């Protein structure tokens, strides 16, 4: 045969655990090129996929980043963690700021935050801080801006307290190449991806974003 | 013999029959000195150049 | 695909027993006179088999029985 | 007198250098040792054993 | 080669058959991948024979392991040699020198 | 067969990695912060930060 | 929201067989991630284009010498694998050594060819060692990808009846060694953006950017799957 053509997956099944998780399996592929395909991919996505997160927030009553909430038997490092998981979508709005202004017994859910058009939570019953039978009262403003990657505090008046942003969507890559098989060859690579996600977008679709960033990427060269 | 014949050409086809029959058939791996009931122990093959 | 028998031990004791039921259950399975209970999904009769006995359908006793019936 | 003579080139002189992990493209911790050993090829080949 | 050698890896390739000296130095008159063809000088040879040595090489024959030894000239056409100098690299060497 | 400890333990190289991998350096690279599980623990690793 | 897209820059080659590149504007850390591609890319696929057969007039096998040369034939086999040609308008082709005569045999004895061009004239060949003694071959380059060894091409014999015939092993991959550099480029109006220096060192038969393009060409369609994953 000529030199241009090459072994393209041929058999490719994925399979979704049930909410966000993603087995992509994608063989057969040339000798070597699993490598190159999944470390591409799970580059683009661990580093470079856009998307929205909480950056900062602002509490009413709590000031220093080592405080105690009369209320909440949680600490503040836990209320920021929390806060952390949060997976939340934005539409063309680049940066919104969303209020919790809740007081009572049960869970400060994060379904008890303040609602928007703009604004989309994928887990409404996310736990953001648990609360006692008492008129304590929790008064916070949560920051969302749209980025493309993660980045610390250390990266980065009021005073507020930061939050380490992660706008990636993806949680979790970690490929592998099995031994495939295909007539008499038997050196070809088979990619196994694995995903997970926020919620935001499915995993299929993940994997769709990042081959598109990356072949926009190789546009002039490709002729 | 027809079948003697084109497994001794090795034609292509034997290689799914092959396949076929590897898929649960346990062989035995045994090591020269077998001094305990360890050293010999049966894996599944998996067919490899 | 198969990987261990330790639910076929705890299900028929003596890891004995088990595969000898087994061998048999193969043997009316694999001759052409029988036929399989659990749906095969690309397994040999052997699998199939222990299959059938971590499951629980077939034993030593349900074996007789289903014989002494035909 | 070996650490001279990497010296008299421009290699390290400690004598491991960094080397880059070559599927995933990114750096070894720890820099690693490299240099030209003599390896022969003993006769008891495969194909007379298989 | 060795590239980290002892030392004393000449004296096993030179003193073993299988390397090959020249056994009066001269000036080579044809090298050929079979035989080589050395022209005595004047002082190293007797009064009355004209001598040129001949050193017929072993091209690809089995030794007793079934390895192949083989022989091929290192000295180019027109080079000086010397008494007890390489002239055919064995199996297993290179200018003289043991390469395992 | 002999004793009642496993004969499975990992021997001489994957004992290295994990050694190396479950250990603490008193200073380095993002020392501190606080993570939201082993999923954000290895995609920070993954990245380098 | 959207990166900046990469395009070359320059094509310096500070030698023949030595090139370096730039894909430049590259934005974070992709640095990285297309060096590592495209390297490996690079050292797995291209069209290279070395010797593949070679019949000389008489021999009967590549075990055996030849009188009035000073090299057996399996060492003109090795020496001929390593022959860098170009072909331009077939995949294989068919080139013709003739010389006669004391001195070193060059690839530039070879027979000109319209096409064909051997892209380093000094490439020794063999050494013939007398007045009335020569060498007559045809080479038989043919142009493929990766590494095909002689004893596996050799399957259904492809009709090989003539024992004259001697096979080299194939070793089409023009690239030698291929390593990335990523550096903070210097723009303007913009925080800290990645370019990316791929120096590579072919054996002279691709141009650098031609390989360059065949790469990205490559990952950017075997890609494809990923675009539409489509279930199963």
Not at chain 1, 119 to 133: G, S
């Given at each position: ?14 399979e979704?655990?049930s ?6 399996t994608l ?12 470390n ?9 996929m856009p ?9 009413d009553?709590?000031?220093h ?9 949680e600490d ?32 400060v859910?994060?379904?008890?935050i ?5 604004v989309?939570?994928?887990?409404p ?12 009262s929790?008064?916070?403003r ?5 980025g493309?990657?993660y ?14 942003a ?13 031994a495939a098989?295909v ?15 926020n919620?935001?977008?499915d ?5 769709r ?11 002039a060269?490709?002729? | 013999?027809?079948?003697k ?8 086809v034997?290689?799914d029959?092959?396949?076929?029959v590897?898929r ?7 090591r ?13 093959p998996?067919?490899?150049? | ?6 639910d ?16 048999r259950?193969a ?17 040999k ?5 222990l ?13 007789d029985?289903?014989?002494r019936?035909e | 007198?070996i ?8 290699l390290?002189?400690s ?6 992990d ?19 090829k ?9 | ?8 890896e000449?004296?096993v ?5 299988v390397?090959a ?9 044809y ?5 080589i ?12 024979e ?7 090489l ?8 079934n ?7 290192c000295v180019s ?5 010397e008494?007890?100098?390489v ?6 060497t ?7 | 067969?002999?004793?009642?400890e496993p ?6 190289d ?8 479950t250990?603490?350096c ?5 020392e501190?912060?606080?993570?939201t ?13």
């Amino acid at each position: 045969g000529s030199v241009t053509e090459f072994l393209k997956p041929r058999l490719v099944d994925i399979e979704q655990v049930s909410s966000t998780h993603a087995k992509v399996t994608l063989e057969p592929l040339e000798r070597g090129f699993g490598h190159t395909l999944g470390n591409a991919l799970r580059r683009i996505l661990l580093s470079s996929m856009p998307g929205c997160a909480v950056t900062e927030v602002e509490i009413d009553g709590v000031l220093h980043e080592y405080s105690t909430k009369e209320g909440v038997q949680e600490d503040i490092l836990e209320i920021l963690l929390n806060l952390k998981g949060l997976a939340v979508r934005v539409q063309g709005k680049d940066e919104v700021i969303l209020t919790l202004n809740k007081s009572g017994i049960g869970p400060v859910t994060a379904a008890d935050i303040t609602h928007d058009g703009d604004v989309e939570i994928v887990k409404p019953q996310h736990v953001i801080c648990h609360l006692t039978d008492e008129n304590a009262s929790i008064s916070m403003r949560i920051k969302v801006q749209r980025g493309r990657g993660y980045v610390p505090a250390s990266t980065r008046p009021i005073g507020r307290l930061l939050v380490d942003a992660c706008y990636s969507p993806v949680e979790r890559i970690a490929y592998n190449v099995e031994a495939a098989r295909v007539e008499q060859r038997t050196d070809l690579d088979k990619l196994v991806i694995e995903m997970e996600t926020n919620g935001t977008i499915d995993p299929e679709e993940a994997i769709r974003r990042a081959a598109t960033i990356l072949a926009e990427q190789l546009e002039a060269f490709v002729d | 013999k027809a079948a003697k014949k084109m497994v001794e050409r090795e034609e292509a086809v034997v290689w799914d029959i092959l396949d076929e029959v590897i898929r649960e058939h346990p062989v035995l791996l045994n090591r020269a000195p077998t001094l305990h009931r360890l050293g010999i122990q049966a894996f599944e093959p998996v067919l490899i150049e | 695909a198969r990987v261990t028998v330790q639910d076929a031990v705890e299900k028929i004791g003596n890891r004995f027993d088990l595969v000898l039921v087994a061998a048999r259950r193969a043997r009316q399975m694999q001759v052409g006179g029988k036929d399989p209970l659990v749906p095969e999904e690309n397994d040999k009769t052997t699998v199939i088999a222990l299959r059938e006995i971590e499951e629980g359908l077939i034993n030593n006793q349900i074996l007789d029985v289903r014989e002494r019936q035909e | 007198e070996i650490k001279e003579l990497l010296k008299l080139g421009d290699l390290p002189t400690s004598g491991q250098i960094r080397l880059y992990d070559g599927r995933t493209g990114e750096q070894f911790e720890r820099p690693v040792t490299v240099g030209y050993m003599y390896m022969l090829k003993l006769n008891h080949l495969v194909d007379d054993k298989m | 080669k060795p590239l980290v050698g002892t030392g004393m890896e000449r004296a096993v390739a030179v003193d073993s058959g299988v390397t090959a000296v020249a056994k009066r130095g001269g000036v080579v008159q044809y090298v050929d991948a079979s035989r080589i063809v050395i022209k005595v000088n004047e002082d190293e040879m007797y009064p009355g024979e004209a001598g040129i040595d001949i050193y017929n090489l072993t091209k690809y024959t089995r030794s007793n392991q079934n390895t192949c030894i083989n022989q091929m000239p290192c000295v180019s056409l027109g080079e000086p040699v010397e008494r007890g100098d390489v002239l055919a690299d064995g199996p297993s060497t290179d200018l003289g020198e043991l390469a395992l | 067969p002999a004793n009642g400890e496993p004969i499975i333990v990992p021997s001489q190289d994957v004992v290295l990695g994990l050694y190396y991998m479950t250990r603490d350096c008193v200073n380095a690279k993002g020392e501190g912060m606080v993570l939201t599980g082993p999923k954000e623990a290895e995609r920070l690793y993954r990245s380098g930060l």
